[PDB]
Design an enzyme around this catalytic site. Structure first.
Site, PDB file in Angstrom:
ATOM      1  N   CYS A   1       0.794  -1.176   0.148  1.00 63.13           N
ATOM      2  CA  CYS A   1      -0.227   0.031   0.139  1.00 63.13           C
ATOM      3  C   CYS A   1       0.885   1.304  -0.113  1.00 63.13           C
TER       4      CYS A   1
ATOM      5  N   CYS B   1      -1.956   1.492  -2.954  1.00 63.87           N
ATOM      6  CA  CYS B   1      -2.849   2.803  -2.742  1.00 63.87           C
ATOM      7  C   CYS B   1      -2.305   4.078  -2.422  1.00 63.87           C
TER       8      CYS B   1
ATOM      9  N   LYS C   1      -0.444   4.921  -5.777  1.00 65.76           N
ATOM     10  CA  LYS C   1      -1.434   4.872  -6.776  1.00 65.76           C
ATOM     11  C   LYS C   1      -2.480   5.987  -6.904  1.00 65.76           C
TER      12      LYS C   1
ATOM     13  N   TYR D   1      -8.636  -3.913 -10.827  1.00 64.07           N
ATOM     14  CA  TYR D   1      -8.778  -2.543 -10.607  1.00 64.07           C
ATOM     15  C   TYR D   1      -7.372  -1.917 -10.856  1.00 64.07           C
TER      16      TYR D   1
ATOM     17  N   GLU E   1      -7.105   1.415 -12.951  1.00 61.68           N
ATOM     18  CA  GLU E   1      -6.394   2.706 -12.526  1.00 61.68           C
ATOM     19  C   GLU E   1      -5.191   3.223 -12.788  1.00 61.68           C
TER      20      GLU E   1
ATOM     21  N   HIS F   1     -26.847  19.959   0.491  1.00 60.47           N
ATOM     22  CA  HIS F   1     -27.094  20.417  -0.783  1.00 60.47           C
ATOM     23  C   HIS F   1     -25.917  21.536  -1.030  1.00 60.47           C
TER      24      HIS F   1
ATOM     25  N   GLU G   1     -25.783  13.475  -1.529  1.00 62.80           N
ATOM     26  CA  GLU G   1     -27.200  13.616  -1.308  1.00 62.80           C
ATOM     27  C   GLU G   1     -28.384  12.779  -2.095  1.00 62.80           C
TER      28      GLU G   1
HETATM   29  C1  LIG Z   1     -26.081  32.942  -0.247  1.00 65.51           C
HETATM   30  C2  LIG Z   1     -26.984  31.750   0.447  1.00 65.51           C
HETATM   31  C3  LIG Z   1     -26.510  30.278   0.208  1.00 65.51           C
HETATM   32  C4  LIG Z   1     -26.938  29.293   0.473  1.00 65.51           C
HETATM   33  N1  LIG Z   1     -26.645  27.797   0.464  1.00 65.51           N
HETATM   34  C5  LIG Z   1     -27.263  27.007   0.698  1.00 65.51           C
HETATM   35  C6  LIG Z   1     -26.538  25.693   0.641  1.00 65.51           C
HETATM   36  O1  LIG Z   1     -25.406  25.530   0.109  1.00 65.51           O
HETATM   37  N2  LIG Z   1     -27.285  24.674   0.967  1.00 65.51           N
HETATM   38  C7  LIG Z   1     -28.533  24.672   1.303  1.00 65.51           C
HETATM   39  O2  LIG Z   1     -29.161  23.501   1.873  1.00 65.51           O
HETATM   40  N3  LIG Z   1     -29.106  25.762   1.538  1.00 65.51           N
HETATM   41  C8  LIG Z   1     -28.607  26.866   1.143  1.00 65.51           C
HETATM   42  N4  LIG Z   1     -28.940  28.378   1.479  1.00 65.51           N
HETATM   43  C9  LIG Z   1     -30.350  28.100   1.847  1.00 65.51           C
HETATM   44  C10 LIG Z   1     -31.238  28.018   0.795  1.00 65.51           C
HETATM   45  O3  LIG Z   1     -31.325  28.733  -0.506  1.00 65.51           O
HETATM   46  C11 LIG Z   1     -32.891  28.265   1.244  1.00 65.51           C
HETATM   47  O4  LIG Z   1     -33.027  27.248   2.447  1.00 65.51           O
HETATM   48  C12 LIG Z   1     -33.893  27.890   0.218  1.00 65.51           C
HETATM   49  O5  LIG Z   1     -33.741  28.679  -0.945  1.00 65.51           O
HETATM   50  C13 LIG Z   1     -35.288  28.322   0.840  1.00 65.51           C
HETATM   51  O6  LIG Z   1     -36.407  27.700   0.187  1.00 65.51           O
HETATM   52  P1  LIG Z   1     -37.930  28.164   0.303  1.00 65.51           P
HETATM   53  O7  LIG Z   1     -38.972  27.186  -0.489  1.00 65.51           O
HETATM   54  O8  LIG Z   1     -38.178  28.318   1.807  1.00 65.51           O
HETATM   55  O9  LIG Z   1     -37.733  29.717  -0.325  1.00 65.51           O
HETATM   56  P2  LIG Z   1     -37.015  30.272  -1.647  1.00 65.51           P
HETATM   57  O10 LIG Z   1     -35.889  29.275  -2.425  1.00 65.51           O
HETATM   58  O11 LIG Z   1     -36.493  31.257  -1.116  1.00 65.51           O
HETATM   59  O12 LIG Z   1     -38.085  30.949  -2.646  1.00 65.51           O
HETATM   60  C14 LIG Z   1     -38.971  31.562  -2.295  1.00 65.51           C
HETATM   61  C15 LIG Z   1     -39.651  32.234  -3.537  1.00 65.51           C
HETATM   62  O13 LIG Z   1     -40.897  32.837  -3.478  1.00 65.51           O
HETATM   63  C16 LIG Z   1     -40.960  34.236  -4.075  1.00 65.51           C
HETATM   64  N5  LIG Z   1     -42.021  34.991  -3.543  1.00 65.51           N
HETATM   65  C17 LIG Z   1     -41.825  35.676  -2.316  1.00 65.51           C
HETATM   66  N6  LIG Z   1     -42.928  36.475  -1.911  1.00 65.51           N
HETATM   67  C18 LIG Z   1     -43.688  35.896  -3.033  1.00 65.51           C
HETATM   68  C19 LIG Z   1     -45.256  36.417  -3.296  1.00 65.51           C
HETATM   69  N7  LIG Z   1     -45.958  37.177  -2.409  1.00 65.51           N
HETATM   70  N8  LIG Z   1     -45.763  35.938  -4.309  1.00 65.51           N
HETATM   71  C20 LIG Z   1     -45.055  34.993  -5.196  1.00 65.51           C
HETATM   72  N9  LIG Z   1     -43.906  34.661  -4.926  1.00 65.51           N
HETATM   73  C21 LIG Z   1     -43.273  35.074  -3.857  1.00 65.51           C
HETATM   74  C22 LIG Z   1     -39.396  34.711  -3.769  1.00 65.51           C
HETATM   75  O14 LIG Z   1     -39.259  35.646  -4.834  1.00 65.51           O
HETATM   76  C23 LIG Z   1     -38.687  33.309  -4.195  1.00 65.51           C
HETATM   77  O15 LIG Z   1     -38.844  33.160  -5.788  1.00 65.51           O
HETATM   78  C24 LIG Z   1     -28.464  29.573   1.202  1.00 65.51           C
HETATM   79  C25 LIG Z   1     -28.944  30.669   1.148  1.00 65.51           C
HETATM   80  C26 LIG Z   1     -28.241  31.971   0.926  1.00 65.51           C
HETATM   81  C27 LIG Z   1     -28.743  33.070   0.808  1.00 65.51           C
HETATM   82  C1  LIG Z   2      -1.314  -1.328  -7.258  1.00 64.27           C
HETATM   83  C2  LIG Z   2      -2.023  -1.749  -6.075  1.00 64.27           C
HETATM   84  C3  LIG Z   2      -2.916  -0.615  -5.430  1.00 64.27           C
HETATM   85  C4  LIG Z   2      -3.830  -0.783  -4.382  1.00 64.27           C
HETATM   86  N1  LIG Z   2      -4.502   0.210  -3.938  1.00 64.27           N
HETATM   87  C5  LIG Z   2      -5.277  -0.074  -2.941  1.00 64.27           C
HETATM   88  C6  LIG Z   2      -6.337   0.865  -2.392  1.00 64.27           C
HETATM   89  O1  LIG Z   2      -6.300   2.036  -2.885  1.00 64.27           O
HETATM   90  N2  LIG Z   2      -6.852   0.695  -1.227  1.00 64.27           N
HETATM   91  C7  LIG Z   2      -6.686  -0.361  -0.417  1.00 64.27           C
HETATM   92  O2  LIG Z   2      -7.391  -0.752   0.549  1.00 64.27           O
HETATM   93  N3  LIG Z   2      -5.818  -1.585  -0.961  1.00 64.27           N
HETATM   94  C8  LIG Z   2      -5.065  -1.189  -1.928  1.00 64.27           C
HETATM   95  N4  LIG Z   2      -4.243  -2.435  -2.449  1.00 64.27           N
HETATM   96  C9  LIG Z   2      -3.937  -3.506  -1.634  1.00 64.27           C
HETATM   97  C10 LIG Z   2      -3.094  -3.190  -0.417  1.00 64.27           C
HETATM   98  O3  LIG Z   2      -1.848  -2.554  -0.884  1.00 64.27           O
HETATM   99  C11 LIG Z   2      -2.853  -4.348   0.201  1.00 64.27           C
HETATM  100  O4  LIG Z   2      -4.076  -4.945   0.783  1.00 64.27           O
HETATM  101  C12 LIG Z   2      -2.003  -4.332   1.495  1.00 64.27           C
HETATM  102  O5  LIG Z   2      -0.666  -3.713   1.192  1.00 64.27           O
HETATM  103  C13 LIG Z   2      -1.642  -5.840   2.011  1.00 64.27           C
HETATM  104  O6  LIG Z   2      -1.225  -5.674   3.409  1.00 64.27           O
HETATM  105  P1  LIG Z   2      -0.417  -7.001   3.989  1.00 64.27           P
HETATM  106  O7  LIG Z   2      -0.290  -6.381   5.432  1.00 64.27           O
HETATM  107  O8  LIG Z   2      -1.269  -8.166   3.606  1.00 64.27           O
HETATM  108  O9  LIG Z   2       0.942  -7.096   3.230  1.00 64.27           O
HETATM  109  P2  LIG Z   2       1.945  -5.913   2.485  1.00 64.27           P
HETATM  110  O10 LIG Z   2       1.344  -4.548   2.481  1.00 64.27           O
HETATM  111  O11 LIG Z   2       1.877  -6.452   1.106  1.00 64.27           O
HETATM  112  O12 LIG Z   2       3.424  -6.234   3.305  1.00 64.27           O
HETATM  113  C14 LIG Z   2       4.031  -7.578   3.230  1.00 64.27           C
HETATM  114  C15 LIG Z   2       5.224  -7.184   3.740  1.00 64.27           C
HETATM  115  O13 LIG Z   2       6.417  -8.379   3.930  1.00 64.27           O
HETATM  116  C16 LIG Z   2       7.423  -8.459   3.263  1.00 64.27           C
HETATM  117  N5  LIG Z   2       7.836  -9.799   3.295  1.00 64.27           N
HETATM  118  C17 LIG Z   2       7.383 -10.821   2.324  1.00 64.27           C
HETATM  119  N6  LIG Z   2       7.953 -12.035   2.561  1.00 64.27           N
HETATM  120  C18 LIG Z   2       8.977 -11.676   3.756  1.00 64.27           C
HETATM  121  C19 LIG Z   2       9.824 -12.652   4.464  1.00 64.27           C
HETATM  122  N7  LIG Z   2       9.952 -13.729   4.222  1.00 64.27           N
HETATM  123  N8  LIG Z   2      10.393 -12.036   5.759  1.00 64.27           N
HETATM  124  C20 LIG Z   2      10.104 -10.632   5.831  1.00 64.27           C
HETATM  125  N9  LIG Z   2       9.433  -9.795   5.257  1.00 64.27           N
HETATM  126  C21 LIG Z   2       8.630 -10.413   3.931  1.00 64.27           C
HETATM  127  C22 LIG Z   2       7.145  -7.918   1.898  1.00 64.27           C
HETATM  128  O14 LIG Z   2       8.459  -7.373   1.379  1.00 64.27           O
HETATM  129  C23 LIG Z   2       6.312  -6.668   2.416  1.00 64.27           C
HETATM  130  O15 LIG Z   2       6.972  -5.539   2.782  1.00 64.27           O
HETATM  131  C24 LIG Z   2      -3.429  -1.988  -3.553  1.00 64.27           C
HETATM  132  C25 LIG Z   2      -2.552  -2.903  -4.189  1.00 64.27           C
HETATM  133  C26 LIG Z   2      -1.831  -2.918  -5.371  1.00 64.27           C
HETATM  134  C27 LIG Z   2      -1.015  -3.651  -5.700  1.00 64.27           C
END
Ligand SMILES: Cc1cc2nc3c(=O)[nH]c(=O)nc-3n(C[C@H](O)[C@H](O)[C@H](O)COP(=O)(O)OP(=O)(O)OC[C@H]3O[C@@H](n4cnc5c(N)ncnc54)[C@H](O)[C@@H]3O)c2cc1C
Ligand SMILES: Cc1cc2nc3c(=O)[nH]c(=O)nc-3n(C[C@H](O)[C@H](O)[C@H](O)COP(=O)(O)OP(=O)(O)OC[C@H]3O[C@@H](n4cnc5c(N)ncnc54)[C@H](O)[C@@H]3O)c2cc1C
Ligand SMILES: C=C1C(=O)C=Cc2ccccc21
Ligand SMILES: C=C1C(=O)C=Cc2ccccc21
Lengths: 588, 588
Positions: free
Chosen positions: B149, B154, B157, B291, B295, B566, B571
């Site tokens: 690894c 891993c 990689k 894999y 990869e 969101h 989600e």
């Molecule tokens: C900058 C910012 C970033 C945000 N980022 C996130 C985020 O990353 N993740 C998240 O989950 N939430 C986020 N929020 C919160 C999210 O946008 C709100 O929770 C969501 O939009 C509210 O939904 P709502 O249905 O209550 O009303 P709104 O989505 O505000 O919609 C109400 C609508 O009714 C209209 N309306 C108002 N009065 C009247 C009326 N009298 N007649 C007709 N239409 C009317 C409005 O103009 C508007 O179109 C963010 C908010 C802000 C301000």
């Molecule tokens: C290209 C590649 C990508 C991988 N990517 C992932 C990944 O993204 N995620 C994941 O979870 N797994 C991944 N794996 C698998 C992961 O690397 C192995 O599951 C893990 O290394 C195995 O652990 P181990 O303890 O069984 O042995 P190893 O980690 O292989 O260690 C065994 C060690 O014992 C030594 N040894 C051998 N014989 C002797 C001896 N007689 N005396 C003393 N020392 C000895 C070896 O030289 C070595 O150092 C990947 C494997 C490969 C080949």
């Protein structure tokens, strides 16, 4: 019990059928409605524990116990034959289609919750109308259908976050071997804004399409509820009309607040303006400490802007303050300046915004620190993120009896019902609920199924995960550490934590022991995981999965016996072992 | 029951204390051992249901029922006073420190599992030795401590994956507004390899440090078990010696296979060589479909290489084949060429590797397709990833009685015990277990606690999540769709699925309806989630959290009532609703 439920269902559904899977003439009338393009809910009695009693209690409404049984707006419309008898003579259109009101449902506000509710209701026969209008900002900014999230919220916010992250990707790429000219790479605001606005435009229009495709009537009109079932609409001609619906869903959201100081409305902006701004903001002052304030300060700085944040008291009030401080700490060390314990007194204009060359104006912000020293500095742009407020006085003739609270939000029962029984409130205006787009969507969809397909499941507002998209992201599910100690007492709380380092950050020479995670657990309740907190890249992808386990009652032992995926940031949750009480240090 | 357990514990522990939290002279002797720098396990009887019987059954071993009670290598060493009586006259060093053997534990192989086991054992008093040696590849490549690894798996990689992803980040950055010269950006292999090798070097050395800091003896020596408790070591001088341990953990892993064709050993390479290669591989042929193969083909192509993959039959055998095809489909559409249903017959050398200018040689690969047409093409580099095999004949004098299987792996009980009762097997050589680094780590740590601190928990090998780090990542937890239908029958299986699109891909003009996810559920068992599958960015961060819920028995309804974060890819799992049986299309 079961009969209180069936009473509500039959009255509320617009077009609903009770049926059985293993019985012919159920199957028989579905296909006919299909052919007739008439939508309806369906309840397979064969598939409920309750079904026993219901088909029997059903005869209280129809004088009948056969399946199929079809109702329309509270009224039995018949058997196998009486309905074929209606298609028969072609009278099944004005039957399924007539109502006391123009609509089974009017949704007021076309945002996250309102569009989701409208759509799901139309899917079970409800004649539905969605109203949306966007009162411009003080400078005249406006936008199309979709709400705060789509137009001026999470969507553009996260895209500009992404553009900010690509800054560090361009930095990282050199250490991973890419021949990269950092002495010749700049960022162009207008190009980015135009890409973001083009994806928003395509969502505005995907939403109109989607309403058209589901026989929902969209009206670009301001809606005012004048009586429980009456909504006054004023259109883009200022023409005034009235429409009627059985159910009303208020989903009008909120708009940014301004502070009451000279020059704030006239010369400052909010997030509502930020994401369509023609010109780069330039040297910017962000006033506020909400996750909005830090998200915006964060990507502006990663875009190369000179950025300052004015903080009245603390960062991210309402969130775990250890995490808030770590979030703040990372931004300060990556360009963001913080004018701590400082408030604004006036904004004075020094230069007017140049529509000509699309360049910002210039402002003098005057303020004062807590220590009495005066703040006075120039900024090309000043952005207020000092909270958000509903605008319901402009929507609820308070004659109608929809009870608001102190803050202007709607007081609701656990099923979203307001104090007017046919009127529901979802999204940000529903008092006491988390203010997030996916909450609003589940609320609206789940509510639409209760109204119009007899569903029972309520929306669960507890343990709703969040993610703050600051330059280093912060995801959380459940309680902050301080709230768990408040509720259960310090000696009942165990906190496991650890620093970690993204593998991606090693060759890139980023920080050891900055990313961080912790589980807040209840010793007395089997080390039940009460709150999960993670600061690091992709914090939303990390956190989301764990919100399922937590909702299921995950304990520390559930985390421990899960095997990590390697190599990931998230796997570190499956091997946590340092406790806080231990005094041992979380470093790596 | 309890007494079978305490019998094993007292015999196996090297230094262990039974105690109570609320009793003085327990607290009293811990501090003294602390002061004496003598490590030990501790079992707080006050904190087990069992404790009742044990302190009572304990008197079978000590003639005693007081706490504290301290044992060393199977033998009661006393009370409050008899131990202070040993510090007293300074004889508590040769008491806690003498054994029949040189070590409580010899670990053979210093990889993921072996280092993790060694470390955790030393933490409870075990006198521990870790042996590691790296037989060079056919071209003489070698590396330091840490295993597959860390050195050739891993870790490198995933870093080269990252460098590959930055290619698309450089592309994406233009649409997000960055002034980027794609007609002047190249990638330099040597710079990247050197960064990766420098982080590996720092892990090799962090592991030596860590062994030194935990009083573990590290030996860069090949280990051969000649008798149950005897290990013959040959060092870098070829000097031969013998050492003895009570417990033996075999953790020697596997090494790549070569196919038996002319020129494969002489002119091809494996993953073992790839990650330290001096020169860019250049136009590359990857032979295999694991894999590993995909990869490597994947990031080489994202690095700009001309890449071809030779596939004997199918991609990613053992993984869900719908997902495998989608993974393959994305790579083909992003540069990777696939010579399908094709095997190699010979590798002929056309140019020798230039140590001079660090440039690859040149090879002619001759092969044949299933359709009888001949494959003949030039490649600068040819990489075999046609599986991996243990090398245990070189480690187990088969006199000793450690039973291997067909494939050369060790047949083990559910607690890792081999057929020789003091000898355990962990990691890749333990027959039938998932071959992954975090599995090996939990196995080794958990086993070390059973040996030396009386723990009982076994490692759970079921539902172990994976992630394949192809250009588009594929994460999975639990059963493939085909295996669930095989085990339970088609009519008992419901599959919810959906396409999705990272928000990050919109402004960047990447693909709609390529990323994809699905839940495989058991209709008959409450829609129990039997397998989760996701194809998209950050697929490991996405999947990890859900592996906790699944281990807890998550159903579809648990996913549905969780609220999304969101905006995230993850989600979309909280809103899935199209089923496969529905025929409806998963598109967006
Ligand atoms: C900058 C910012 C970033 C945000 N980022 C996130 C985020 O990353 N993740 C998240 O989950 N939430 C986020 N929020 C919160 C999210 O946008 C709100 O929770 C969501 O939009 C509210 O939904 P709502 O249905 O209550 O009303 P709104 O989505 O505000 O919609 C109400 C609508 O009714 C209209 N309306 C108002 N009065 C009247 C009326 N009298 N007649 C007709 N239409 C009317 C409005 O103009 C508007 O179109 C963010 C908010 C802000 C301000
Ligand atoms: C290209 C590649 C990508 C991988 N990517 C992932 C990944 O993204 N995620 C994941 O979870 N797994 C991944 N794996 C698998 C992961 O690397 C192995 O599951 C893990 O290394 C195995 O652990 P181990 O303890 O069984 O042995 P190893 O980690 O292989 O260690 C065994 C060690 O014992 C030594 N040894 C051998 N014989 C002797 C001896 N007689 N005396 C003393 N020392 C000895 C070896 O030289 C070595 O150092 C990947 C494997 C490969 C080949
Ligand atoms: C605690 C903070 C921090 O760590 C960084 C910045 C900051 C700004 C305003 C208030 C508090 C902080
Ligand atoms: C199914 C495949 C695919 O989709 C793409 C490439 C490929 C290569 C070899 C075998 C199968 C496939």
């Amino acid at each position: 019990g079961t009969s209180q439920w069936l009473r509500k269902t039959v009255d509320s559904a617009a077009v609903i059928l009770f049926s059985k899977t293993t019985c012919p003439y159920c199957k028989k009338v579905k296909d006919v409605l299909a052919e007739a393009k008439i939508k309806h809910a369906t309840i397979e009695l064969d598939q409920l524990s309750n079904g026993s009693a219901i088909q029997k209690c059903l005869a209280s409404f129809s004088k009948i116990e056969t399946v199929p049984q079809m109702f329309v707006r509270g009224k039995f419309i018949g058997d196998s034959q009486t309905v074929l008898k209606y298609y028969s003579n072609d009278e099944l259109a004005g039957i399924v289609n007539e109502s006391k009101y123009d609509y089974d449902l009017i949704v007021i506000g076309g945002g996250s919750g309102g569009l989701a509710a409208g759509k799901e209701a139309a899917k079970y026969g409800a004649k539905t109308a969605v109203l949306d209008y966007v009162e411009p900002t003080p400078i005249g900014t406006t936008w199309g259908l979709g709400g705060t999230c789509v137009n001026v919220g999470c969507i553009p916010k996260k895209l500009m976050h992404q553009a900010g992250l690509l800054s560090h990707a361009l930095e990282d790429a050199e250490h991973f071997g890419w021949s990269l000219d950092r002495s010749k790479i700049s960022h162009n605001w207008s190009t980015m804004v135009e890409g973001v606005q083009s994806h928003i435009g395509s969502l505005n229009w995907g939403y109109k399409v989607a309403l058209r495709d589901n026989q929902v009537t969209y009206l670009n009109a301001k809606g005012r509820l004048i009586s429980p079932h009456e909504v006054q609409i004023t259109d883009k001609n200022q023409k005034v009309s009235t429409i009627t619906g059985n159910k009303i869903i208020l989903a009008t959201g909120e708009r940014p607040k301004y502070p009451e100081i000279p020059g704030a409305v006239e010369y400052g902006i909010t997030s509502d303006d930020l994401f369509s701004l023609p010109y780069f903001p330039g040297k910017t002052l962000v006033i506020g400490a909400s996750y909005v304030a830090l998200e915006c300060a964060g990507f502006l700085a990663s875009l190369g802007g000179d950025v300052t944040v004015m903080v009245r008291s603390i960062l991210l009030r309402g969130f775990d303050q250890q995490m808030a401080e770590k979030v703040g700490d990372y931004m300060e060390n990556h360009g963001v300046k913080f004018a701590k314990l400082c408030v604004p007194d006036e904004i004075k204009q020094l230069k007017v915004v140049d529509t000509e060359n699309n360049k910002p104006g210039l402002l003098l912000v005057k303020g004062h620190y807590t220590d009495g020293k005066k703040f006075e500095e120039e900024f090309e742009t000043v952005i207020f993120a000092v909270g958000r407020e509903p605008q319901l006085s402009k929507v609820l003739c308070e004659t109608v009896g929809v009870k608001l609270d102190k803050n202007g939000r709607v007081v609701c029962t656990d099923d979203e019902q307001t104090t007017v029984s046919n009127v529901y409130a979802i999204g940000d205006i529903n008092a006491g609920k988390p203010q997030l787009t996916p909450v609003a969507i589940q609320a609206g969809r789940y509510l639409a199924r209760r109204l119009f397909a007899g569903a029972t499941e309520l929306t669960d507002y507890s343990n709703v995960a969040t993610t703050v998209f600051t330059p280093l992201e912060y995801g959380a599910c459940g309680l902050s550490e301080e709230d768990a100690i408040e509720k259960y007492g310090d000696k009942d709380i165990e906190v496991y934590h650890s620093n970690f380092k993204p593998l991606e950050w090693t060759v890139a020479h980023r920080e050891d022991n900055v990313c961080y995670m912790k589980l807040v657990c209840r010793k007395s309740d089997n080390m039940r995981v009460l709150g999960l907190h993670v600061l690091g890249p992709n914090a939303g992808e990390i956190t989301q999965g764990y919100a399922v386990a937590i909702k299921m009652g995950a304990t520390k032992a559930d985390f421990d016996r899960t095997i990590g995926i390697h190599p990931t940031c998230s796997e570190t949750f499956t091997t946590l072992h340092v406790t806080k009480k231990s005094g041992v240090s979380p470093i790596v």
